[PDB]
Ligand binder design. Structure first.
Ligand SMILES: *[C@@H]1O[C@H](CO)[C@@H](O[C@@H]2O[C@H](CO)[C@@H](O[C@@H]3O[C@H](CO)[C@@H](O)[C@H](O)[C@@H]3O)[C@H](O)[C@H]2NC(C)=O)[C@H](O)[C@H]1NC(C)=O
Ligand SMILES: *[C@@H]1O[C@H](CO)[C@@H](O)[C@H](O[C@@H]2O[C@H](CO)[C@@H](O)[C@H](O)[C@H]2NC(C)=O)[C@H]1NC(C)=O
Ligand SMILES: *[C@@H]1O[C@H](CO)[C@@H](O)[C@H](O)[C@H]1NC(C)=O
Ligand SMILES: *[C@@H]1O[C@H](CO)[C@@H](O)[C@H](O)[C@H]1NC(C)=O
Ligand SMILES: *[C@H]1O[C@H](CO)[C@H](O)[C@H](O)[C@H]1NC(C)=O
Ligand SMILES: *[C@H]1O[C@H](CO)[C@H](O)[C@H](O)[C@H]1NC(C)=O
Ligand SMILES: *[C@H]1O[C@H](CO)[C@H](O)[C@H](O)[C@H]1NC(C)=O
Ligand SMILES: *[C@H]1O[C@H](CO)[C@H](O)[C@H](O)[C@H]1NC(C)=O
Ligand SMILES: *[C@H]1O[C@H](CO)[C@H](O)[C@H](O)[C@H]1NC(C)=O
Ligand SMILES: [Ca+2]
Ligand SMILES: [Ca+2]
Ligand SMILES: [Ca+2]
Ligand SMILES: [Ca+2]
Ligand SMILES: [Ca+2]
Ligand SMILES: [Ca+2]
Ligand SMILES: [Ca+2]
Ligand SMILES: [Ca+2]
Ligand SMILES: [Ca+2]
Ligand SMILES: [Ca+2]
Ligand SMILES: [Ca+2]
Ligand SMILES: [Ca+2]
Ligand SMILES: [Ca+2]
Ligand SMILES: [Ca+2]
Ligand SMILES: [Ca+2]
Ligand SMILES: [Ca+2]
Lengths: 423, 423, 5, 71
């Protein structure tokens, strides 16, 4: 077990004890990055996350050796990930599409179970209990629960609530904790929304976002502090800061190999995933129900699936004005062959300036073809193109120009404030 | 009336039943899930006819058999053939086990050694392969030998509608088909231990038999026969049984009224408490004479010729010489026989929840006015203390002859608001 | 504001 | 709300044309859940055969091959 948390910068794993502050897992980082959803799979020791700058959901091992994409198609803003460790279904809320999507890992079946929401932020799934929990922070804010299927969607806490930014489940006692960022409070209740109690006032917590519950403690992430803080799950009490001065601080999640155990009818050893082809979902009173991907309907057997192009006709990777990448991304057509890797797998920059896959206006053309570089790298004093045709034949920028009298002319013919001489 | 989604014509007895139930042709409403499951939950199998099952689908949470019958999901791969066509057990990767706890029962069960060929089938193979693997055996009586397999089931299951002995003796024409019982006796729901004809409709079902007392005889058409003696309207009694003190007549009033046992007499190894009344005792065995605890009304059993000496300060000393524990002083019981443990005592008053009788005996207030003399003197059973005066209703409020107060205007309002045309 | 942007 | 607007269950106002237009204008699905429209017709220029749900390419008319069920 260790405390897993995200950021603008990177996703990090730190020990629960403050005695040692050395990262337990190698940080996950990219140069264009903004990491907002996170969840873990202790069986294969992998961590799922979403990069809101690339709109791609990845999975990466703890030691960082193996990184792959889960999906990169039709994502707008994946606010929160959650993983059903028994049935191996990955759920996520989409703030842009205003919907929540379930994806199976064994085969890439995908289904948009819940739609037509307003501001879905946080999602938590309870495999053994069978419920999924969701928060919407629109004006009539509510916390909703439903079966893992996505049916029976009914409100659970819809009064005295505003901006419920985060949800967490106390696995030890089967209680649902959530944070309110408007009233600046932590509340908890049973899975039925009854016996609602409010924790004691926390000292400086004033814009909480993510929380998680581990042993006797709640770990809250606060945006305004830029910090992760810890309190007792009973009444709050002895607030302790775990890290200080994050860039932007997003979710926390308690990695734990102990809680990712147990089984139900979806993980029986005697037969495959509860005999349901494609998706099987846990249901309360320890039942299971089968599902089928988009474009496919469940048959009379209530377990096998067949194609239904009448209600759910097939769709292409994306609309007309765009190029489909290999990883499933889609990019505007006028960003193909610009020398910039926009697909994040170099699909849009493959085989440019040959067989009439022409370069875009954003590139400069190599003389003999077979490559393009950004127009910003033409005459940039670097030899980017193999034949040197980007730096050959480059005229100077020794123009008829002057520098403002308030300013000093560098010998490189750039102007600076006259006060920056001899500093 | 068109019951069950206007598909079943059922007798219009007015017993309309819930949407959470499936109406049978017999009027019995099982819950709605108990159709098309190849259990005959009506008995008659109306619930299991092709008329319904050819135009039905299972609830999403059930498993569906190859024949289209539904079955609760937990019955999948459970070593039981619940579908009939065994699809619930098809393609299950059952556990391997070793000879110390398995003989390879066809269903894949692992059953302990000495439980194979033990005289009784336990692995529930359809061919009874648990037991018939041993040729030479034939067993003791009562545990009856059902034909060519060595199995031996008590005669409590034979000619009964269950082929549970596996081999056909349990139902087939060596008995059963020509008669249930010889003319001296009559059937039971599972015992071939048939009941003599005068046993049924005597007061108790003499075996499992929902007709013995309910409908095999006229309730009130004729009495107990003069061969035996009436003692309650539900029970007649043979002879000696009226005198022994046993609860045989079923109101227990045998040893009373005026017919029998004002007195008793003791045989060998028994002694009579001569100084006693019917409420206490009048014969005890030698197993209790001069033992550690008083038995008779006056505890004469412990005096006899014994007249022992040893008694210390650890026990209260009586006048007659016998001793008892200190707790048995000043109480409701005659512990010492001599009443020395009670003479001179000063009883503290009863608790709040304790009614007090005129003689000083405390009884629970619950016991008051229950038509039982709980303290002897009848303080708790008297006319005016146990009185509920009828409501006055002095004007308006014209009560009807059934004995409840109703408004004056309701009388001859052409509405039968009282018991039987009282208004 | 509470928008994640 | 104005006569030119619907009243949503939560008290939002949305235009007459926006009622069941296929968008969550009421933000509580009131305008979509209330009146479920039945667009089972060919609004296209494609030529509908008399009495059928079948509608076909306009080029079919006397082109030499029976294209509607009755030709
Ligand atoms: C906010 O949550 C409450 C509680 O879930 C919603 O009120 C209504 O609560 C009842 C349970 O008390 C839900 O079930 C109903 O119960 C009555 C019996 O009391 C029964 O006669 C009904 O048939 C029904 O089963 C009811 O569904 C629930 N209402 C809804 C629409 O969920 C309250 O409505 C919620 N606020 C909003 C914005 O709807
Ligand atoms: C564009 O990119 C594809 C790879 O996705 C590349 O194979 C095409 O090259 C060739 O274009 C020829 C026409 O200019 C065509 O006849 C040929 O089959 C094709 N493929 C190969 C292997 O030579 C690029 N051009 C086009 C127009 O697709
Ligand atoms: C056989 O029985 C022994 C116990 O004597 C047990 O240890 C073993 O696992 C069993 N099975 C096999 C495959 O040997
Ligand atoms: C198993 O039992 C059924 C009846 O209970 C019987 O009809 C069937 O033939 C048996 N299976 C085999 C393979 O003999
Ligand atoms: C097309 O879009 C639909 C939803 O409208 C499904 O997501 C489907 O999976 C998509 N098809 C492809 C090829 O990704
Ligand atoms: C060049 O041709 C290709 C043909 O696939 C693309 O249309 C591309 O956008 C074109 N770019 C320019 C600058 O003409
Ligand atoms: C560089 O190009 C500029 C264009 O404004 C001038 O023509 C200048 O004269 C050139 N530099 C030299 C060294 O002649
Ligand atoms: C010189 O050039 C700068 C811009 O590079 C300013 O326009 C400035 O006003 C110019 N001065 C003269 C005298 O032309
Ligand atoms: C099959 O019957 C069940 C139980 O009543 C449901 O009605 C189900 O919806 C039916 N099947 C389909 C595909 O509609
Ligand atoms: Ca606030
Ligand atoms: Ca590009
Ligand atoms: Ca260059
Ligand atoms: Ca300087
Ligand atoms: Ca049944
Ligand atoms: Ca079974
Ligand atoms: Ca046996
Ligand atoms: Ca039997
Ligand atoms: Ca009887
Ligand atoms: Ca008796
Ligand atoms: Ca005695
Ligand atoms: Ca006493
Ligand atoms: Ca009484
Ligand atoms: Ca009347
Ligand atoms: Ca609308
Ligand atoms: Ca034609």
């Amino acid at each position: 077990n260790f405390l897993l948390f995200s950021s603008k910068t990177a996703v990090r794993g730190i020990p629960f004890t403050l005695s040692t502050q050395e990262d337990v897992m190698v940080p996950v980082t990219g140069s264009p990055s903004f990491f907002v959803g996170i969840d873990f799979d202790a069986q294969h020791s992998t961590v799922f996350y979403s990069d809101l700058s690339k709109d791609i959901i990845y999975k990466q091992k703890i030691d960082g050796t193996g990184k792959e994409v889960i999906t990169a198609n039709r994502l707008e803003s994946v606010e929160c990930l959650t993983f059903d460790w028994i049935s191996r279904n990955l759920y996520w809320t989409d703030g842009g599409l205003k919907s929540v999507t379930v994806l199976r890992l064994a085969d890439k079946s995908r289904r948009q179970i819940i739609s037509n929401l307003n501001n879905p932020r946080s999602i938590v799934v309870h495999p053994t209990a069978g419920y999924m929990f969701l928060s919407d922070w629109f004006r009539p804010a509510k916390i909703m629960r439903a079966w893992s299927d996505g049916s029976h969607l009914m409100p659970i806490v819809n009064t005295s609530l505003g901006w419920p930014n985060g949800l967490a489940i106390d696995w030890s006692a089967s209680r649902l904790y959530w944070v309110d960022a408007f009233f600046d409070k932590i509340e908890h209740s049973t899975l039925d929304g009854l016996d609602r109690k409010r924790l004691g006032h926390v000292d400086q917590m004033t814009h909480p976002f993510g929380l998680t519950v581990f042993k006797d403690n709640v770990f809250i992430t606060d945006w305004r502090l830029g910090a992760i803080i810890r309190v007792r799950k009973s009444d709050g009490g002895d607030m302790t800061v775990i890290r200080r001065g994050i860039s932007s601080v997003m979710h926390v999640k308690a990695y734990d190999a102990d809680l990712q155990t147990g089984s139900n009818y979806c993980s029986q050893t005697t037969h495959a995933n509860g005999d349901c082809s494609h998706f099987c979902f846990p249901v309360p009173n320890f039942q299971r129900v089968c599902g089928c991907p988009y474009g496919m309907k469940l048959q009379r057997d209530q377990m096998t699936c067949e194609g239904d192009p009448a209600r759910e006709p097939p769709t292409q990777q994306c609309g007309s004005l765009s190029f489909p990448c290999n990883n499933g991304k889609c990019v505007p057509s006028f960003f193909r062959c610009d020398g910039v890797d926009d697909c994040h797998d170099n699909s849009d920059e493959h085989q440019c300036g040959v067989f009439n896959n022409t370069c875009s206006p954003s590139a400069f053309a190599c003389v003999r073809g077979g490559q393009c570089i950004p127009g910003q790298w033409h005459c940039d004093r670097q030899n980017d193109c193999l034949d040197g045709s980007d730096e050959q034949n480059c005229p100077t920028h020794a123009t008829s120009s002057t520098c403002p009298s308030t300013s000093f002319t560098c010998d490189n013919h750039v102007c600076i404030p006259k006060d920056w001489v001899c500093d | 009336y068109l019951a069950n989604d206007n598909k079943y014509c059922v007798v219009d007895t007015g017993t309309r039943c819930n949407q959470l139930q499936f109406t049978c042709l017999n009027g019995h409403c099982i819950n709605q899930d108990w159709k098309c499951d190849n259990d005959n939950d009506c008995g008659d199998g109306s619930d299991e006819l092709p008329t319904v099952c050819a135009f039905h689908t299972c609830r999403s949470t059930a498993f569906t058999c190859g024949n289209g019958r539904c079955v609760p999901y937990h019955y999948r791969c459970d070593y039981y053939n619940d579908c009939g066509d065994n699809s619930d057990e098809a393609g299950c990767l059952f556990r391997n086990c070793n000879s110390t706890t398995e003989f390879t029962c066809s269903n894949g069960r692992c059953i302990p050694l000495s439980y194979v060929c033990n005289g009784i089938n336990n692995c529930h193979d359809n061919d009874t392969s648990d037991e018939k693997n041993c040729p030479p055996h034939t067993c003791p009586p009562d545990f009856t030998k059902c034909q060519t397999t060595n199995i031996c089931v008590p005669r409590a299951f034979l000619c009964d509608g269950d082929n549970d002995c596996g081999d056909g003796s349990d139902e087939n024409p060596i008995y059963c088909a020509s008669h249930t019982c010889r003319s001296n006796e009559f059937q039971c729901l599972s015992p071939q231990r048939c009941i003599p004809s005068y046993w049924f409709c005597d007061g108790e079902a003499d075996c499992a038999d929902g007709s013995d007392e309910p409908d095999t005889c006229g309730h009130s058409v004729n009495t107990c026969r003069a061969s035996q003696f009436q003692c309650d309207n539900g029970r007649c009694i043979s002879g000696n049984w009226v005198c022994d003190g046993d609860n045989d007549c079923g109101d227990m009033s045998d040893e009373d009224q005026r017919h029998h046992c004002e007195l008793q007499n003791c045989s060998s190894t028994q002694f009579t408490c001569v100084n006693s009344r019917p409420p206490n005792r009048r014969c005890i065995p030698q197993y209790w004479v001069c033992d550690g605890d008083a038995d008779c009304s006056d505890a004469l059993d412990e005096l006899q010729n014994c007249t022992m000496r040893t008694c210390s300060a650890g026990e209260f000393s009586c006048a007659n010489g016998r001793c008892v524990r200190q707790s048995f002083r000043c109480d409701r019981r005659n512990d010492c026989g001599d009443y020395s443990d009670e003479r001179g005592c000063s009883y503290p008053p009863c608790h709040a929840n304790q009614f007090t009788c005129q003689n000083g005996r405390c009884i629970p207030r619950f016991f008051v006015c229950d038509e039982d003399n709980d303290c002897g003197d009848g303080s708790d059973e008297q006319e005016h203390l146990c009185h509920t005066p009828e409501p006055t209703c002095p004007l308006h409020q014209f009560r009807c002859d059934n004995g409840h107060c109703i408004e004056m205007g309701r009388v001859c309002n052409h509405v039968d608001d009282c018991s039987d045309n009282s208004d | 504001x509470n928008x994640x942007x | 709300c104005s006569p030119t607007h619907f009243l949503c269950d939560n008290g939002n106002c949305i235009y007459k044309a926006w009622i069941c237009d296929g968008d969550n204008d009421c933000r509580d699905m009131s305008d979509e859940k209330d009146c479920p429209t039945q667009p089972f017709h060919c609004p296209s220029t494609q030529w509908q055969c008399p009495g059928y749900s079948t509608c076909i390419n306009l080029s079919a008319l006397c082109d030499g091959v029976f294209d509607c069920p009755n030709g």
